[PDB]
Design a protein around this nucleic acid. Structure first.
Ligand SMILES: [Mg+2]
Ligand SMILES: [Mg+2]
Ligand SMILES: [Mg+2]
Ligand SMILES: [Mg+2]
Ligand SMILES: [Mg+2]
Ligand SMILES: [Mg+2]
Ligand SMILES: [Mg+2]
Ligand SMILES: [Mg+2]
Ligand SMILES: [Mg+2]
Ligand SMILES: [Mg+2]
Ligand SMILES: [Mg+2]
Ligand SMILES: [Mg+2]
Ligand SMILES: [Mg+2]
Ligand SMILES: [Mg+2]
Ligand SMILES: [Mg+2]
Ligand SMILES: [Mg+2]
Ligand SMILES: [Mg+2]
Ligand SMILES: [Mg+2]
Ligand SMILES: [Mg+2]
Ligand SMILES: [Mg+2]
Ligand SMILES: [Mg+2]
Ligand SMILES: [Mg+2]
Ligand SMILES: [Mg+2]
Ligand SMILES: [Mg+2]
Ligand SMILES: [Mg+2]
Ligand SMILES: [Mg+2]
Ligand SMILES: [Mg+2]
Ligand SMILES: [Mg+2]
Ligand SMILES: [Mg+2]
Ligand SMILES: [Mg+2]
Ligand SMILES: [Mg+2]
Ligand SMILES: [Mg+2]
Ligand SMILES: [Mg+2]
Ligand SMILES: [Mg+2]
Lengths: 80, 82, 86, 205, 61
RNA sequence: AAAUUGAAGAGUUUGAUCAUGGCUCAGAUUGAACGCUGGCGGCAGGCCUAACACAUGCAAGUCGAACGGUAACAGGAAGAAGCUUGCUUCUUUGCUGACGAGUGGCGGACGGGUGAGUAAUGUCUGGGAAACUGCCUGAUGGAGGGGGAUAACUACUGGAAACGGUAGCUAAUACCGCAUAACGUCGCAAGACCAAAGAGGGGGACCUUCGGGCCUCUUGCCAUCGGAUGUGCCCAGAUGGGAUUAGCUAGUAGGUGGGGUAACGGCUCACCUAGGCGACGAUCCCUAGCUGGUCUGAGAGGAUGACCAGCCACACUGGAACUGAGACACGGUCCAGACUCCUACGGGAGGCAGCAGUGGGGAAUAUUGCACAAUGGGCGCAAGCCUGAUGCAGCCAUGCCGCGUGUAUGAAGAAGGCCUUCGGGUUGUAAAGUACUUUCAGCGGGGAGGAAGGGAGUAAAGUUAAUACCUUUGCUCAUUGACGUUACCCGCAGAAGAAGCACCGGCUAACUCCGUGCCAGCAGCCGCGGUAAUACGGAGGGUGCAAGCGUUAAUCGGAAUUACUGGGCGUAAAGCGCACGCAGGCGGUUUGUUAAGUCAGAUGUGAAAUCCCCGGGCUCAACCUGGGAACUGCAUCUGAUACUGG
């Protein structure tokens, strides 16, 4: 129901914060080629149950700091 | 506040008003929330000269949109006609 | 000022500033008293200042300079400080 | 805003009769319309692909008495409208007030019809119109005004419009000097010596 | 720049105000512009009958 | 029923041909300039450069139904003082008309102008919570009781002026504390705290200090929660070039606590962690307001931001803050710098990138014009005032559209000119002559529409004690236009007052002589002139356009010549000298699962404007307008599972 975005994590070397990467599959407006574009975001991962590589799911709630407005919901793909 | 008023969009010596709901702090023919009918003082016979939307006018006056002088003098004519 | 309206409005504004400066400084001093009592570490002295600063920080909200949200935030912060003291 | 000069040099240049004369005098007796005008009409020059299209468009323009800008506007309207572009252009050209009144027979020539239209003698649907380019709609009522019904040239044109061809899309009556535009003329109804494709090819550039 | 005077006869000399338009001369290297006659000081060609507008010549009576 | 009506090549490498490829040309458009010419009307446009500085006039004022009062007028309401039986004086103006200045609140943050800066803090599309809101409006409560002054005014007094100072006089919707006040604030609760302004028309009795008390109507005053508008903030995707700009960032990334904003947030502070951005272009340089839109293009695309409309930024330059709900404010404040101006030398005044207009720049961009009569704004309950926005007038052919500059006859094929083979033809029905019209320009009359509103009375309804006073509904007389010698119609007479420009060797529609002789000169290309020039200048003739014609500057097409639609790499330009390989690109075959892309349907939005389709109004058109379609996009929901993807 609530608009949520699933993406792979990049870094977790921050207090209560991680860096997620989203791979949106879009088509080139000119050549019609289907490429992938990064959508790197900073997520306020309270109680960081996340490492590197595992995919997570985030939702936008409100601006929590200067450069993040997203919060974690669930962790799927946790096994490495 | 929101006000029902006119907006000239015709030509020189041939006016044609588009009755619209617009904020008071706006130009005569600038930005308006919605368009409600029209008016033509030089409209010939056997043709529409006023097509006000009384339903929308009532809806806006229920929310507090004030009606200007000419549109107030035209809504009564519309009610008298039909 | 060229226009008479602007010429009189400048005098109006400077007189309003002169009047409001004293009123703002008064409540600033009263809030400073509460903060000093809080940092002192006395619950009784903190409340004895809070219960009299509250009327002067609430009467101006529906009077001008300060706002309801600002008054509520200041009152909540001071109440939290009093509660956490000692 | 109209041609003011010889009415037979254009016909000689085009090579055929442009109907710019009333018809009382024979076209061959009126002028030596066999060759192009000027001092070099004896030679027969081989006309190019652009040349034939330009000559056709100029012939149509001079026959209908319009200018280049008005002809371009009419072509744009024909292309905008649905159906055959050339047929629509021909119908629009033969829909002007001067053209329709000439076809009815109130004017000797195109110039005479245009002058009658301009001088406030033609009335359409009981309304005074002095526009030579005034388009006429189906089921209209063109009529000579009461003041101009007693014109010697008008009645001469009325009596001289009979011995020539008669359009089958107009309802004319000289007793009251009035006519009705029953329906839009067709390509077969109009002249068959005009190449429609040349004009559209020329204007496709 | 270096312009090219058109026609025959030009009273212009040093310290003369002229008007310059585009258009070069094919058979002259370096020139890329043309002095337009009938300008502030560039007088038109005398006794001109054809294409008088291109050389700034008053219409004869 | 319609929003699909869409695709042109040519010249030039060579003794000759093909292909590649370069240049140029035909077409359309502009905020256009230049040269020649030039009649009218309608609709639009008119500093693209010096955001160069400004003489001068006007652009934001109004409210006495808030208050003290009367400095000009009038009724001199009005007792009125020596009343010339209208003459003068205090005045009465918390009596009525009204009123310069003053206090108070409202408006100045709207309207108007510009694109310097900003390549992202800006703009467009789609979402979100963490907040405000004068004026508009709904619901529920209340307006009880007093103070201290202050401007005006008055006596001085410094300065040339800007401007001030000194002691009282005094007002209120200016200010403040009491008391009441929760669905308001704080607080887990208990509990603690926060507001006020009165005015206007009347009225019998009850009434009176003889000013009045009291009832109703009218508008305000407050506290809370709502509706609309305006907003402030965040995220996602897009928004010029340069890599001959490759590392940048230490309040910088995050965290704890405090402070701050109406609101979330390193917005800020103290501490701790060493992180964050970056070949999906970080950082830096130049350029540039963005969008709907406009031109061109069949389409995809390219260029562009003229007018109008939505947003942002700016107001001599820079910094700052206050009043104000709303500004870090064009005609508000303070300070620093330049400029200009007055001076008694001590000291002061101003910011046209507003309407006009001035001085310079330029190739060029308008009159120091009328009116609030309408549409709106600001003030006022109203009447009423302001409004260089707006409605309009003036100039310019700057663009589009329409009309005219006569028509039907008219072969003695008049005269003259042009060439000629001297017999001829061309100008040419062209001209002259005859007949017939008067559109447009001029004169004289008639004459709509843009006018709905407002005041004064009258009948009815809502009101109360009331036939007073108010509001509303109909009725009758007053009324109102700058445009405006309006659009338009009618009579006068006369064919008058009304046509020029470019080109003519091929591209491209148009040929013959005269004057020179690679000289004079033409030119976008091919190229011409050395005595036969259809290419130079003129003449005759012809072609195109038309109140316009050509040149110039820019854009798109042709250019399939940046090719995603739509190219090539053996020899014209194009396979790295070869191999390995990271990121990346793609990927054999079957099943099940997911449904991210993809496919179907629905919802919201994709502003208005503009294009297109069907109709209407301007006598046609330009132009305006109603509806439809379209806005090719995005987000969400419900399904389909063949393909790609997990
Ligand atoms: Mg024209
Ligand atoms: Mg067609
Ligand atoms: Mg050759
Ligand atoms: Mg400018
Ligand atoms: Mg500019
Ligand atoms: Mg300036
Ligand atoms: Mg004025
Ligand atoms: Mg201001
Ligand atoms: Mg700029
Ligand atoms: Mg008050
Ligand atoms: Mg109280
Ligand atoms: Mg009180
Ligand atoms: Mg914090
Ligand atoms: Mg193309
Ligand atoms: Mg702009
Ligand atoms: Mg100014
Ligand atoms: Mg100006
Ligand atoms: Mg100059
Ligand atoms: Mg007005
Ligand atoms: Mg004034
Ligand atoms: Mg002769
Ligand atoms: Mg009228
Ligand atoms: Mg040539
Ligand atoms: Mg191309
Ligand atoms: Mg190729
Ligand atoms: Mg090679
Ligand atoms: Mg080679
Ligand atoms: Mg090799
Ligand atoms: Mg190598
Ligand atoms: Mg899916
Ligand atoms: Mg879909
Ligand atoms: Mg019509
Ligand atoms: Mg739209
Ligand atoms: Mg699969």
């Amino acid at each position: 129901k609530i608009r949520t975005l699933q993406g792979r994590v990049v870094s977790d070397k921050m207090e209560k914060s991680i860096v997620v990467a989203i791979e949106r599959f879009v088509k080139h407006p000119i050549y019609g080629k289907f490429i992938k574009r990064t959508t790197k975001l900073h997520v306020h991962d309270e109680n960081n149950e996340c490492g590197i590589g595992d995919v997570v799911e985030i939702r936008e709630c409100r601006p929590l700091s200067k450069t993040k407005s997203w919060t974690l919901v669930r962790v799927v793909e946790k096994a490495v | 506040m929101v006000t029902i008023r006119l907006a000239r969009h015709g030509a020189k010596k041939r006016p044609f008003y588009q009755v619209v709901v617009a904020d008071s702090r706006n130009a005569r023919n600038g930005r308006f929330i919605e368009r409600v009918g029209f008016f033509n003082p030089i409209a010939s016979e056997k043709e529409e000269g006023t097509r006000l939307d009384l339903d929308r006018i009532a809806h806006w006056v229920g929310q507090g949109a004030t009606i200007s002088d000419r549109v107030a003098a035209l809504i009564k004519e519309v009610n008298k006609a039909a | 000022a060229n226009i008479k309206s602007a010429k009189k409005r400048a005098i109006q504004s400077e007189k309003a500033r002169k009047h409001n400066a004293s009123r703002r400084s008064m409540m600033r001093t009263f809030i400073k008293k509460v903060y000093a009592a809080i940092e002192a570490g006395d619950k009784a002295a903190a409340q004895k200042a809070f219960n009299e600063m509250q009327p002067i920080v609430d009467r101006q909200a529906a009077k001008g300079l300060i706002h309801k949200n600002k008054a509520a935030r200041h009152k909540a912060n001071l109440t939290a400080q009093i509660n956490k003291l000692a | 805003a109209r041609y003011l000069g010889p009415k037979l040099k254009l016909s000689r240049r085009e090579g055929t009769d442009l109907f710019l004369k009333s018809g009382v005098r024979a076209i061959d007796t009126k002028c030596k319309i066999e060759q192009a005008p000027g001092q070099h009409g004896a030679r027969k020059p081989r006309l190019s692909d652009y040349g034939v299209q330009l000559r056709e468009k100029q012939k149509v323009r001079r026959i209908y008495g319009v200018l280049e800008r008005q002809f371009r506007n009419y072509y744009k309207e024909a292309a905008r409208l649905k159906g055959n572009t050339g047929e629509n252009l021909l119908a629009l050209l033969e829909g002007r007030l001067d053209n329709v009144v000439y076809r009815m027979g109130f004017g000797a020539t195109r110039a005479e019809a245009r002058q009658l239209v301009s001088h406030k003698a033609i009335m359409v649907n009981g309304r005074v119109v002095n526009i030579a380019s005034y388009q006429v709609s189906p089921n209209d009522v063109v009529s000579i005004r009461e003041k101009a019904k007693k014109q010697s040239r008008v009645k001469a044109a009325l009596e001289l419009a009979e011995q020539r061809e008669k359009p089958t899309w107009l309802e004319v009556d000289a007793g009251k000097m009035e006519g009705t535009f029953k329906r839009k003329p067709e390509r077969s109804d109009l002249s068959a010596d005009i190449n429609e494709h040349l004009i559209v090819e020329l204007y496709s550039k | 720049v270096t312009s090219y005077i058109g026609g025959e006869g030009h009273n212009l000399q040093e310290h003369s105000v002229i008007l310059i338009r585009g258009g070069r001369v094919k058979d002259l290297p370096g020139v890329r512009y043309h002095t337009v006659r009938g300008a502030l000081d560039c007088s038109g060609v005398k006794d001109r009958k054809q294409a008088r507008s291109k050389y700034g010549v008053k219409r004869p009576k």
